[PDB]
Amino acid sequence: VPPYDVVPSMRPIILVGPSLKGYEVTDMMQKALFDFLKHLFDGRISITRVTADISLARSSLAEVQSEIERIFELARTLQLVALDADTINHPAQLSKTSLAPIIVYIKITSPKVLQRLIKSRGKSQSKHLNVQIAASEKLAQCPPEMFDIILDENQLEDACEHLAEYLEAYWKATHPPS
Amino acid sequence: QGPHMALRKEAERQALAQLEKAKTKPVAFAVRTNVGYNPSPGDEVPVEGVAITFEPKDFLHIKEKYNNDWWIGRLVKEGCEVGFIPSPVKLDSLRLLQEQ
Amino acid sequence: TKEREKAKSRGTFQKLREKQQLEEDLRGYMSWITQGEVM
């Protein structure tokens, strides 16, 4: 085990799991958080789509490394980098990587609330009921300190303010005063 | 005593002048610590005391490489300042010197 | 007495404030879906 393992200069924010990605439940609630940060830290952020399955470090080894070293180039100018990754749903899904994401834990506090949100998205989401509550139960069993930001607030103003100060404070630790 | 204190007191101020202009030099890369460190008297820092000490899983904004025994960077933390980061071959040599 | 020797002997109050607590979660998290899919 070497002591030093090459991370980017600015860790990319990972928005994980109200439920499984690939559905109307998960992504649209995450689409609130790419909407918030796009103009809250506007001028100090780089928000990008991650199409390649970066958990493999299926997508080939040249495609993933190209997306790996892109994020190495995105965090080069001391700017906040955000990732719109669709394959990523778990902390251990990216434990082995040298990216070290600021894993942001969107939590619905009760599973009864979530299954009411699945019925409201339509019957085309009702065909996927128990598969969605499965991985959110996994993340409810996941340890809290293995994440970085744990969000359980219902108002967008509440969880995003909790989001805003934690991304401003990390901007201060990455930018010491003169 | 007298003959040794002329080179062994300017080598600190040559490294502190290496330390004082390094605070504006850009961040080269950053690493993830897999061990911890505390600076000792026998660690032989060119500037005694100004080096940093970290715990496990920390992040070091490596500004630059001081010599083959030390780097220059800072722990990524509010209020913390630039210090001396040991290179891994020096962290290996600080393990061998304890056994012998 | 009847406020704490009918309902406290029952426990309807926890049932009522739960459903209100879910009512804040329904209104809370529906708005993010409401905000997200249009933007």
Our answer on whether B and C touch (3+ beta-carbon pairs < 8 Å) is no
* Alpha-carbon gap, residue B36 to C18, rounded angstroms: 47
**The CA-based dihedral angle spanning residues A15, A20, A23, A28, taken in that order and rounded to the nearest 10 degrees:** -20
Write down the residue that tokens 């934690």 correspond to: A166
A2 C-beta neighbours (distance < 10 Å), count: 11
CA nearest A146: which of A99, A90, A96? A90
Minimum CA–CA partner of C30 in chain A: A117
For chain A, the three-class secondary structure string (H helix, E strand, C coil) is CCCEEEECCCCCEEEECCCCCCCCCHHHHHHHHHHHHHHHCCCCEEEEEECCCHHHCCCCHHHHHHHHHHHHHHHHHCCEEEEEECCCCCCHHHCCCCCCCEEEEECCCCHHHHHHHHHHCCHHHHCCHHHHHHHHHHHHHCCCCCCCEEECCCCHHHHHHHHHHHHHHHHHHHCCCC
| DSSP 8-state symbol, B6 | T
Whether chain B lies against chain A with 3 or more Cβ pairs closer than 8 A is yes
A31 and C36 within 8 Å at the Cβ level: the answer is: yes
Contacts of A144 (CB under 8 A, 6+ apart): A105, A150
CA–CA gap between residue A28 and residue A11 (Å, rounded)? 23
- What is the Cα–Cα distance from B75 to A39, expressed in whole angstroms? 29
Contacts of C31 in chain A (CB under 8 A): 155-156
Distances (CA, A) of A156 to A6, A84, A121, C24, C39: 35, 19, 19, 12, 14
Interior angle at CA A37, CA A34 and CA A39, nearest 5? 110
How far is B89 from A92, CA to CA, in rounded Å?
A: 30
Neighbours of B77 (CB within 10 A): 16
B63 and B73 Cβ atoms separated by less than 8 Å? yes
**Looking at beta carbons, which residues of chain B come within 8 Å of A3?**
31, 33-35, 88, 91
Task: Residue A118: give the domain boundaries.
Answer: 1-178
- Domain at A151, CATH number: 3.40.50.300
The tokens for A84 are: 């719109």
Token reading at A6: 């090459």
Residues 6 or more apart in contact with residue B32 via CB below 8 angstroms: A4, A5, A6, A7, A98, A100, B57, B58, B59
Does A108 contact C29 at a Cβ distance shorter than 8 Å? yes
Q: Pseudo-torsion of CA A167, A169, A173, A176, nearest 10°?
A: 120
Q: How was this structure determined?
A: cryo-EM
Q: Are B39 and B46 in contact (CB under 8 A)?
A: no
Range list of H helices, B21-100:
88-99
Chain A residues in contact with chain B using a Cβ-Cβ cutoff of 8 Å: 1-9, 11, 78, 98, 100, 169, 172-174, 176
Report d(CA A81, CA A73) in Å as an integer.
Answer: 10
Count of positions (residues) in chain C: 39
Q: How far apart are CA C17 and CA A72, in angstroms?
A: 49
CA C1: distance to chain centroid?
26
Contacts of A2 (CB under 8 A, 6+ apart): B34, B88
Tell me the CATH number for domain B1-100.
Answer: 2.30.30.40
Strand-strand pairing, B29-33 and A102-106: unpaired
Q: Are strands A149-151 and A102-106 parallel, antiparallel or unpaired?
A: parallel
Return the number of other C-beta atoms located less than 10 Å from residue A165's C-beta: 10
Distances (CA, A) of B33 to A136, A162, B68, B91, C7: 30, 28, 18, 12, 57
Rounded-to-integer distance, Cα A10 and Cα A3, Å = 19
User: Is C28–A29 a contact, with Cβ atoms under 8 angstroms apart?
Assistant: no
A143 touches A95 (CB < 8 A): no
Q: What are the distances in angstroms from CA A122 to CA A23, A31, A68, A117, A118? A: 11, 18, 37, 9, 7
Domain total for chain A? 1
Check if the beta carbon of residue A87 is closer than 8 Å to that of residue A54.
yes
Torsion angle of the four alpha carbons C33, A155, C27, A82, in this order, in degrees rounded to the nearest 10: 10
